[PDB]
Structure formats: structure tokens, C-alpha cells
Design a protein around this nucleic acid. Sequence first.
DNA 1: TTTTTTTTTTTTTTTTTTTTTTTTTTTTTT
DNA 2: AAAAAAAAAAAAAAAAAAAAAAAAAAAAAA
Length: 740
Amino acid sequence: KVLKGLDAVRKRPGMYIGDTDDGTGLHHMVFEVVDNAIDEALAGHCKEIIVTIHADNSVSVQDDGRGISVVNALSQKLELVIQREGKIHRQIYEHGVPQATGTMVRFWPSLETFTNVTEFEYEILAKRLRELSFLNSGVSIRLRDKRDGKEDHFHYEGGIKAFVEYLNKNKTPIHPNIFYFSTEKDGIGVEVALQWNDGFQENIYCFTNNIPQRDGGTHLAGFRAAMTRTLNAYMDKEGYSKKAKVSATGDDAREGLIAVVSVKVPDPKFSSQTKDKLVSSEVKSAVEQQMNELLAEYLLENPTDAKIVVGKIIDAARAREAARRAREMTRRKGALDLAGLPGKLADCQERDPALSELYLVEGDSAGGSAKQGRNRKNQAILPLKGKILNVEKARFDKMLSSQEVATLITALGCGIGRDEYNPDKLRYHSIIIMTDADVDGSHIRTLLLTFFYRQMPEIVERGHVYIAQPPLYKVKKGKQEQYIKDDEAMDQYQISIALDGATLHTNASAPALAGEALEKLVSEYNATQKMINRMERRYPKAMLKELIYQPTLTEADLSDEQTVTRWVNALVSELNDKEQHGSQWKFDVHTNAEQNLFEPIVRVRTHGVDTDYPLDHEFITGGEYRRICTLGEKLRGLLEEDAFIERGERRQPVASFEQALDWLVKESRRGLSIQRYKGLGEMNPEQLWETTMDPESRRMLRVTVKDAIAADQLFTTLMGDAVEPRRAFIEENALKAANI
DNA sequence: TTTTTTTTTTTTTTTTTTTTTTTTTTTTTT
DNA sequence: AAAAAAAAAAAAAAAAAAAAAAAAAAAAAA
């Protein structure tokens, strides 16, 4: 029982602990023990964790809590001495084989499993322990490197303030005070800290239950939104912006910012098993509210620092203003005066171009949805009418449509005629093509790009044209919510939910596989399945799927006639056993006298139609078979007889990776609910503001021309009158997609 | 100071138009 | 002869208007 699990862990140590070649497994074991010690300490029982690095390639972690397995299997020895109630009890585990106020565990890593990294780099351990000391306020950590004689004492009662001070010790902080708080509201404990510096670089560090988040997350978005809102409100109230004659925006307060954000959710939800991005919906609101209150309170309390921060922000805003191109003010449509603009236009209030935007939307319903949710000061909306003229196919004199005339009038380039064209009189220096997220939205985007590239080439060159990316799907699982752009992102999200909070055990008594390793296995499986589906015309799906689990057939096996017969006979017998349809599989071997190779053939009789699928020499080294062999080598022995999986409460014995994946997906899609938006008229205006109108949470794309000649050729082929180059291009791309 | 006709509800009855995309023909224009 | 331009077949994206039927307020003719 226990020995089976220990041997299972010992067979594939990289699956459980991580890649041992780079020494990451040893560091992972040390951090696991330190994490257990910190978990004991968080219950208010331990206060010192003396981590000693010995000279015999071993490390011991002391604990002072209440006190009294992957680590036992990989470790060749374990020294567990529990000092409880005035008693000392010693137990020694040797490869998980036992021989008979916390503990010191002096684990011995087995040199067989780990390769190329024996000794521990104490700088990495020191960095991680210092980070944990900052995160865990009032928790002493003692590093003791005995081999080199060095020692250290990481102990900071401030915590996040100490983290900010450590980050800013080498840099030049701009003001002495450090904003901080550790308020907790409805269980979402939030800790934030701030200190600007003269480096004009942004560095915001995010943590979630003492786990770093590389790619930000909901806490990062809430922090940024709260900071921008509070600083803008302070600027507007005190009137420093009017004296500066410039409006501060995002990426100016954030410029030259050092901050740390730490959260502790009871049930966190991440985008993947790497936990590099938090996607928990509830975390944003608490961070936003606490920042909105307390940062404003700090600004009121510290007017000396507020002046310096406002001065730096004004300097950044002045630099950004100076970087802009020369321009002039322009009349805007208003209640008193219309200035000869279209009725459908909903113009803004800011007369200055380069502080205004135009959203080109697909219709009147999307127009109303965007008009209800926007910023009236900056953003203007010009709703089109469905699909517009293809100016490439159409004549120049055919451009007398109300749709294109409305677009020409609002931009006021006067591009009609090719005589009054003047991009210097452009009314908006940010033209945004906010079409629907669906296929016809993409087509209308292409038509608008043709209009802008052909009729207004300098507007595209100067970078005024932008593309919005509104979401197509909204997915909800009770409290959780997300916005998804494409079906590929939908598939990735479905995989992430399937692997969310689930454990796979090779044996009945064995530990769970690592989340990263399981994600890599599932990614390999999905890639191979996609390749097999692409190969479905050439060969049957059943034979290709069965080739994964069979032994690999190398070129040396081809020369031996008996080996090929045994291999193909085993393959066909396995196919016949696992057959749920009327297909009848039979084997044959064809002998080439030229090359002395006995190639196999797998005859099939499906639906009464007999067919032969010879696996020639090309297929053995055809590239796809290499991928099949690699996945087979990965998946030979990841499922014993008593394998099972779990998703927390529920359990399921399994016998194949297909069964486990299907069960995981089926449990993923239990509470799921997808809302597909068939254009912006189906989104609420608040949803439009959150996703793709707010500059804080915007995701745009500048249209640029890398090559003029290649762009012209592509436009003429895809959008010209001649159909044959278009058909050839589409067929070539279809074949390219079908092939690797 | 007085008629008269015009706007607005909210349920009813009615219709109308503009583009994309590919073959194939028919005009018409040189 | 030759090129260019318009129309129509079928699925897609967009939208536009005319009147009844009461009350009650403007905003001009008289």
C-alpha cells in the first residue's frame, strides 16, 4: 500500500516535485517544508523557524508550533524529532520506510533522483525567506548556512513596509512617508503599500497567500483603478491641473511607482495551475474600496507628500504633452451649435484633438449601447449602417453612399476628391474601429481598414487608427465571472476549469500529480488529439489513438520480420478488443525486396467497406509519429489498476486518461453558463465600460504598416475584383492550417 | 385676448431601404 | 473587338417611415 505509492513517486519524480535537472526539486522540497512551518505559525503557535543548511548536503527546518508523502519518497533519510510536552520522540524514515514546541526535520535528498545540482544556492533560499518574512508580519526566520559559516535573521514587524523599504533601499525615494494598511473586510485580507521614486519606472508586486502573481490579476486592476481615481479626484479638487494646463492620466502616477499588494482569499481562483494570474472576481471590489478610502485619507493627512507627488505627475504630463504633434482646436457638436455634422454622431466636449476619441460602431443599437456607457468629455460615437462599400472593388464615383459620407464628414479630413485631402485637420487623433466580436464584425473591420488604407493612407501611417477588442463570451460559475474574446480562449478557459481544484492519483495510495505537470500532459494530449483529427482523412482515428499506448516501432524493428508481425498483431488485437462499432480489424505485412523492410498494414472493414492503411517508411518518421511516440512514452504508466481522480468532494475511479479528462470536463461544465454577445447591443453599457471603453482596463491595437508593397499586394488580392488569387490564397491558407 | 393646428404618450394597422459575396448575362460606350 | 458597368440569384450585417385613439401643453393666425 504505502510502498506502492512511494515507488510510484520514485518512478517519475519530475512529475511530482518538478524538474530536478536545474535543482528546482530541492528548492521545492525546502519551500514545502517552510510552507508547512509557516502554516503552523499562522495559527499563533510558532514564532521562529530556524532553517539550517548543513555541510553534508542536507537542510533542517526547526519549528516552534504545537507539533505532533512526496518528501519522504524522494528523500533518502528523514530526521523527525518532535519536542512536545517535555518529551523527545525520534522517528527515522528511509525512503518512506520507518525503522520504528515543534520539530526539526533534517531531510536528506537522494542523490539518485536529482542530477547536476547537489548543493543548495543559499541566495535563492534567502530571497524566498525574506519575502515570506515580509509577507508574514511578526514571524522570525533564521537562515544559518553552516558550510560557509554565514548567518542571517529575517525579522520585520512592519511587513509590507519592510518590503517597500527593501525595494527602495538602492533607489532614490521621492518622499519619506510610506502609505500602508492591513484592513480585512469579509475575510478578504488586503495589504497594500506605496512609495514613489525618481526612477520613472513602474514595479508593482502582487501576492496571493504568499504566492507571487507575475501577470497581475484582479487585485492589480483594482489597485490601479483606485489609485487613478483617487489621484484624479485630488488633482481636480485642489486645482493643480488647471495651473499645469494638463490633465494627468494613467501611466503617469504609475510612472516612478514602487508598491506591493498582498491578498489572502479563502478560496482563490487562478487562470492556470501556475498561479501567475488571479481571476477571482470578489478580490477587485475590496481592494478598490479600501484604496479609495485610505489613500485619500493619507493624501489629506500628508499634504507635504501630496505636493511632491502632484509635481512629479505634472512633470510627466508635461513631458507627454510636449511629445505630441502640433495641432489646433476644432469645433464640436453641441446643444447650441451643430457645426454641420451628422445627426447620428454623438460628439464629445473636449475641443482639443489628441484628447478625444471616435468609436466607429456597427449600428444604431450598438450606438445606443456605447452612447449610454462612455465618457462624454473625451469619447465620441459615429454609428455606421451594417456593411459598407468595398472601395477596392467599387469605383471612385461609386463612393456616394450615406455611410461613407458620414464617416468623411466626422473625421473632416476632406479626403473626397483627392484634392482637399488634409490629415492636419483631423478632428480625432484616435479613430477606434469598435465592431462586433463575431465573423461579420471581422468582415466589417476589414472593409473599414480598406477604406482607411486606400482613401486616407497618411491617417494609418501616423498611427491614429485603433482597433477595440470587445469580448464575445461571458462565462459564470456562481460568484466567478470572466470575459472571453475568442473560441481558443474559451477552450483554454474550459481546460483551466477542468484542472481547477482536481487531483489525479496513479495508484489508490499515492499522492496527487503536480498541477504544472498535469497541465503539460493535458496540453500535449490536446495537441496530439488535434493532430490526429487533422489526420482523420488519411487514417482511422481509432488506429492513431491506439498507436499512442502501443510500444514504439523504430526503423531497426522494420528489418526483423517477426517483430513487426508481433507489433501489428498486438495493435490489431487491442483494436478488436476495444471496438464499440462494427469495424473488423485485420493485419498484413508487405515485404519490400529493394530495402529489405517488412512494412505493416492494418486492414479495416467499417460499414461493410474494406480498406487498407499501410504504415509505410514515411509514416514511421513522418513527424506526427514522433509526437505520438513522445506522448506514449509520457503516458505508458501513469495509470495503475487502482487509479482514481478527485475534484474535492467527489471521487471517480478511472482506467484511462480519456475517462479522467472526460469526467473532469463534465464536472467543469456542471454550473457553467455562457452568454454569447451577438454585438454590442446585447451588452449592458456598464459591461461595455468595464471591458473596452475605460482607459484603465482597455485593450487596443495600433494599426501599422510594416511594408507598403506587401500590404498593397495583400489588399489587392483579398479585396480586388479578381477572384482566382483570392481563391488560391484561401486554399493555400486552408492547406497550411491542415498541415503542421 | 380667443381659434386653430402641432407635439407628446402607448397599444394597434401598415409598409420601405443600404451593403458583402460569385457567375453569368445584357448595355453602353470606346 | 474590347473594356467597363449594372442586375439578380441566396444567406449575412444594418437600419426607415405613414396613420387611429384621448388629454394637455405650446405657438402661431385671427
